[model samples]
Target chain A: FNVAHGLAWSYYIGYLRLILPELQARIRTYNQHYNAVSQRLYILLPLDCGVPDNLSMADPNIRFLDKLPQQTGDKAGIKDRVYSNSIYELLENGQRAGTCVLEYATPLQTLFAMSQYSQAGFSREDRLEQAKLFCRTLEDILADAPESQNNCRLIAYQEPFSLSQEVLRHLRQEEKE
Target chain B: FNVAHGLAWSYYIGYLRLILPELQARIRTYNQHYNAVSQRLYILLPLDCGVPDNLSMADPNIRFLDKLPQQTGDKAGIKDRVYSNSIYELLENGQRAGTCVLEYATPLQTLFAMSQYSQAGFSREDRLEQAKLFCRTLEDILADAPESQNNCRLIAYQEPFSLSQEVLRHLRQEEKE
Candidate 1:
């Protein structure tokens, strides 16, 4: 379900629709606000070419797991993180495009030293869950400054559909298979 | 040095320069060689969008380290592997340079996680040690019937300049700093 992806896009869309305008009003520059937020929220930002800021993962807002005991060696460790970042759309359907590479390091990689997923990659099924959870996280962060929550319910803040108990049981059984 | 990027390019380069030529001569069509090799070496081929295979990493030629035990449940373990896959030059400089993508087992992953003095993304001083090793490994693989070593020197495969023993000692000591 590329839920992570969809959520990423949705989060971006929601932010663009509900949050960014509010942030832009107070911040000096729209670009700076975007980058500042990305640095605080994303796991991989463009700045992290390889040497990931080991400390960033500790953020209560971020989730990270390093499979090995992070022995001090160059051995690219096995690790993963889920976070958000942003890239600007330089154009619309009939406009200029691709001028930025999501400098807001909110989502990027260090070594991407894991199986199948990019350093910025997260488990889809589960990341989908996390992506779903991101809504509240973003909402909580935005609750303070802009009173952005008012319009959020219309776009950004959505009620997730509850999974039926029967469906849950079936999924549980199928998971074993 | 973006070693991963280099290896990807080198792998592509070697295939185009050496193996592709050899395969083109024997197979009924140059395209058939692709199917034959993909049958022997890949599970995903040109059409696989994102789904990867699960078995290939177990093969001796593959080096994958998932870090965590391959337990069930998508806990999203940290894993990485070093291998090769291909993508078509979908819309390129001015032409559809590529004929197709390499989708085997659909797609696969583990970790790969290096570099050369420059080409590979190894550190000139630190990761350089790790990058140095990948060269020998790639060399041996090419030695097989494919004769990858056939034109080894052509691709800048060579022993790096030997650092003086004193310089090595100093570098080792400086490594801690």
Candidate 2:
């Protein structure tokens, strides 16, 4: 894809981060299940990775990165989790949003997604069903990408973002949820 | 319990509330699974309730206090979401620790307690395990309580607190968890 294609992805991500906090707080007031919001999608955040067993909820950001639930049970492949992006055309109307990268296909082994155009009526159960099918299509796309050649698990979070004060990296392959 | 007993209970509750916010935040950083932190802990704040199909986590808290996971699979008998508090009595060691009245014993059903003297290294799992045996002993105590002469089923959340929210009130015969 071209710059416009990449731009759309950023627009989506930017908008989400912008509203996530508010959305989360309100969601918190509603179900209080907000704590399970999710840290990754192919992303390392697994479905059950709730509050940390080690820390508290106050100023959550203060904790160490390694402490993040980047494990299989926490459901993460982010251990050696490293990746650089290269977006390709995803032929769809907008129902198929996507994200994240991983060191191997495993952390991404279990995933679900919605496109920038995912509709309003689909249920979470419904979305997971659609994802099962979409994943097959995606597997084909990834196996064919020039960068992946047939590997790269179609590009996966295991992370490529470098913060100015980024902490040392965590090769968490040995850890479990 | 005496004035000192009441004072001790407040002290523990005060200490925990002071720390719960921070604990929850750090807990968030660890797993990123914020969806599971839990919104209401019975007393309709409605006891164990269910969610509506139309609500996404979109503005979960915006939906209703009555819509949350608190179901039986999670194994709560919040009994149509009802009940409230008042500490019964906490044992010197593991002999006494419990509270809450319920619409059904199922929810308030699976409880054991940690007294004002609880220390570190006490895993909830281990505690619960011990409570398994202790619950039997306590169940006998409860079954024989002045008010509980015999009847007390209906159920609950797992929050640990001590009295004076006024027990006998949440015995909400009209609620459901």
Candidate 3:
């Protein structure tokens, strides 16, 4: 769970922070505009460990952490109770997207994605069938994704610096014309 | 949550102290027997709450009050980073049930009572069925014991008092005979 969260947070926030600051700023401004356009459609400030040491330490103007009830742990240490609490939290706070939120939103997101990506005519029955296909495809991809040892290393580093540089040099020579 | 905990501590401990002295010698004997039976069981020492202005102050042994954690506010207010450290103090150390040593032996007591009162020639399954019937009968008797104004007073208050007095009186009558 922690590894998945790390991967998603690093991908999303790192991309925004490092690769496309201008695009990120534009998205933030777009979010603000959409928030004013429709109160219910407003995006909440994302919470990440990198944002603050504690959520309470974050600036109130740009971020807000909702106050939780006092009797929160009266029923702690129970598995079902904790899961129920997590479900409620997700529904109330909106989707986290591509990580904790995405994992939680698995059912809904799969259905929506299927309806969008299906080549078949978009009918209710077609969409439902496409969703099952999408789920199968996702499972196959996940299963085939390299696990352990040399297989995992090969997938990750199959096209290292030499291969990438040779391809770049070829593109560069072609551009000289 | 703090207020609820405070209220629960006051009520339960007050009930224990009120009933303790008459049962003290018996409890001590039971404690010795329990220790011999299982090394895990031990009597917890009580706590001292200072007297109010109207009453004379005397220290009393009350376990729950002395062991409560000092932390305040709701569960979510505390950072998840501090959760492991606070868990023992907040829950495991503070509650009498945390040690997992206290055994009420209620089922054993019930079995003893059943053996004494139950008729002969019954198989184990028959005995269990009889016990279930007996419980259902008791529930019905209690449900409508009091009518109208005191409808909620379900217990037959005179039943135990009468039974105790009859047994004692019978013993005295037997001596005279």
Highest TM-score model number:
1
What's the true lDDT of residue B113 in model 2? 18
**Local distance difference test scores for all models:** 0.26, 0.23, 0.22
Give candidate 3's whole-model lDDT. 0.22
What digit string (tens of lDDT, one per residue) describes model 1 on residues A14-59? 2333334443233234344344211111122221122223322222
lDDT of 1 at A100: 21
lDDT score of model 1?
Answer: 0.26
Instruction: Report the error of model 2 at residue A22, Å.
Output: 35
**Which residue pairs collide, candidate 3?**
B46-B61, B46-B62, B47-B62
Alpha-carbon runs more than 4 Å astray in model 3: A5-49, A54-57, A60-68, A71-177, B1-177
Q: Provide DockQ values for all models, in the order shown.
A: 0.02, 0.01, 0.02
Order of all candidates by lDDT, from best down to worst?
1, 2, 3
Worst 10 residues of 3 chain B by lDDT: B81-90
Candidate 3 local lDDT, B1-177, one digit each (tens): 011111112212222222223333333344454441111212111111111111001111111111111212122112321111011111213232221111111111222232332221223444343333333433343333232121111111111112222222322343463
Model 2 lDDT per residue over B100-137, tens place:
22111211111211221122123344433333333243
The Cα error of candidate 1 at residue B4, in Å, is 28
* lDDT (10s digit) by residue, model 1, range B76-149: 11222112233222223343322222222110111121111122223435433323333343444344424432
